[PDB]
Symmetry: C2
Subunit: 47 residues, 2 copies
Amino acid sequence: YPCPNTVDCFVSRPTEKTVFTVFMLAASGICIILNVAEVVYLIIRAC
Amino acid sequence: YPCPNTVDCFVSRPTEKTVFTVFMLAASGICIILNVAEVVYLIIRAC
């Protein structure tokens, strides 16, 4: 509401936004894996 | 086509057009009944 029925809307720069989103998601996943590895290494150091 | 999805369109003077349509339909029905009665009367004249 208040758009009647269904309307089409157009997104600015979908492809460039997709590329940057892929970059950020890959970097975030690498960060997650690195944090997990750091925790495992610190635990091994503790033992 | 080419209207995307479903769009709303607005009709000019729907109520006045409805009133005139009712008038014309009633007159046409009266004409039909009168023609049928005329045919029946002419047949009775024949017999």
